Amino acid sequence: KGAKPERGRFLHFHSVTFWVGNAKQAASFYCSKMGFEPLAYRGLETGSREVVSHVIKQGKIVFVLSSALNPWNKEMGDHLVKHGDGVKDIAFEVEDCDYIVQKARERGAKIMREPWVEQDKFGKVKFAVLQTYGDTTHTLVEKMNYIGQFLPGYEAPAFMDPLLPKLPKCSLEMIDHIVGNQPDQEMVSASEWYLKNLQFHRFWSVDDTQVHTEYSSLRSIVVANYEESIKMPINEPAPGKKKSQIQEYVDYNGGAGVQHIALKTEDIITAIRHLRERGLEFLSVPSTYYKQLREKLKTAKIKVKENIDALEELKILVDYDEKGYLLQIFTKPVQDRPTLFLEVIQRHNHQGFGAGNFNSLFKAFEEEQNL
């Protein structure tokens, strides 16, 4: 629902690139604990002498972990003092990369690297880099007759962990959305960047038909491409009954940045059962949430399809409306600062993001403390 742009097309998320302190051990964390697999590699052994990158894959989800190779790299070094580990760049796969770059320059988006083409044995890929909020960037990916595993300039993984094949699969298929926190009075700035320069559009869900700010302590504005596969909320703090997770994020980040990545699944019970086997840690949810959940469901128009005794067993959260529902869960922050975490979401005729769960978790904790 919008107005189709003239030329060009944002297909989907390509990859999320982490600038981390140790790329080697960080890829091991996301493979062992979150269910990814080594896909490609670039570093000293392939011809890249300044930057090393471990590309890992699950379903269509592609993470690439990057670290600097030489000492005293200003950009990568600075970024680690400010943010620690965290998301550096979000990549889109596009048709007609040239026009999209020319469109955004016309409206006022700075171009970090204008279109250039790399080539190898499998084809040629166009790339171009635009910058968004904080130190985050967007690199556009245009495949011009490419049939390689990932991208040019990458070879096979430097080491195949023999532990990964003995581990259960996590049923993570694609990236649902990615959240970017902003300081106050920058949510409008950060979101309209995508509307103005990229010709995205404001996405509306059942989250926006109510005010959950007293429980959410945040204001959201979700921005999506025309085909609406790339959904991407933009947050900023707001007065609420508890300390703002958005303000504390911007505090520990030093600025704006990606708060969490949403990995979609179609078997969220198997997903969370197997993630907890591998050793990933999720947020605690008191029994009050599920006592209260069964009460609401009696009056509810919809019915939850999964075994609700397994949800309480696995600490998966639930949110619904008149038409459908969604099941979501959150990991403990994947680093030590209260900055970035991740989300596993399964949708059942529901396009929301679980904004009603802010109130739900609040009532769950409130009755637990009171009892």
Ligand X SMILES: CCN1c2ccc(C(=O)c3cnn(C)c3O)cc2N(CC)S1(=O)=O
Annotated binding site for Fe cation: 177, 260, 343
State which of residues 67, 137, 253, 357 lies at the interface with ligand X (CB under 6 A).
Answer: 357
State which of residues 104, 317, 342, 344 lies at the interface with ligand X (CB under 6 A).
Answer: 317
The answer to whether 332 contacts a copy of itself (rule: CB under 8 A) is: yes
Taking the C-alpha atoms of residue 38 and residue 161, their distance in angstroms, rounded to an integer, is 8
Nearer CB in complex with ligand X: 104/179: 179
Provide the CA 124 distance to its chain's centre, in angstroms.
27
Taking the C-alpha atoms of residue 190 and residue 235, their distance in angstroms, rounded to an integer, is 9
| Per-residue contact flags (x/-) with Co ion for residues 335 to 354, judged by CB under 5 A | --------x-----------
Q: Which does 82 bind (CB under 5 to 8 A by kind): a copy of itself, Co ion, ligand X, none?
A: a copy of itself
Taking the C-alpha atoms of residue 252 and residue 306, their distance in angstroms, rounded to an integer, is 37
Taking the C-alpha atoms of residue 140 and residue 127, their distance in angstroms, rounded to an integer, is 5
- Binding site membership: which residues? 177, 260, 343
C-alpha triplet 66, 115, 101: angle, nearest 5°: 105
β-bridge partners, 51: 68
The answer to whether 82 contacts a copy of itself (rule: CB under 8 A) is: yes
Nearer CB in complex with ligand X: 171/181: 181
The answer to whether 21 contacts a copy of itself (rule: CB under 8 A) is: yes
State which of residues 105, 196, 315, 337 lies at the interface with a copy of itself (CB under 8 A).
Answer: 337
3 state DSSP class of 148 = coil
Taking the C-alpha atoms of residue 109 and residue 103, their distance in angstroms, rounded to an integer, is 9
Query: Where does 96-146 have alpha helices with state H?
Result: 97-107
Query: Where does the chain have alpha helices with state H?
Result: 23-34, 74-83, 97-107, 187-198, 213-216, 245-253, 268-278, 288-299, 308-314, 356-370
The answer to whether 187 contacts ligand X (rule: CB under 6 A) is: no
The answer to whether 319 contacts Co ion (rule: CB under 5 A) is: no
The answer to whether 253 contacts ligand X (rule: CB under 6 A) is: no
User: Which region, judged by CB under 6 A, interacts with ligand X, from 3-11, 150-158, 187-195, 351-359?
Assistant: 351-359
Q: Which residues are within 8 A (CB) of 275 and not within 5 positions of it... i.e. 6 or more apart?
A: 33, 34, 35, 170, 282, 344
The answer to whether 44 contacts a copy of itself (rule: CB under 8 A) is: yes
Please, which of residues 321-340 interact with ligand X by CB under 6 A?
Answer: 330
3 state DSSP class of 334 = coil
Nearer CB in complex with a copy of itself: 101/342: 342
Taking the C-alpha atoms of residue 126 and residue 144, their distance in angstroms, rounded to an integer, is 7
The residue ranges that bind a copy of itself (CB under 8 A) are: 20-26, 28-29, 32-33, 43-44, 52, 67-73, 77, 80-85, 159, 161-164, 251-254, 276-279, 281, 332-338
The residue ranges that bind ligand X (CB under 6 A) are: 177, 179, 220, 222, 233, 245, 283, 317, 330, 341, 343, 353-355, 357-358, 361
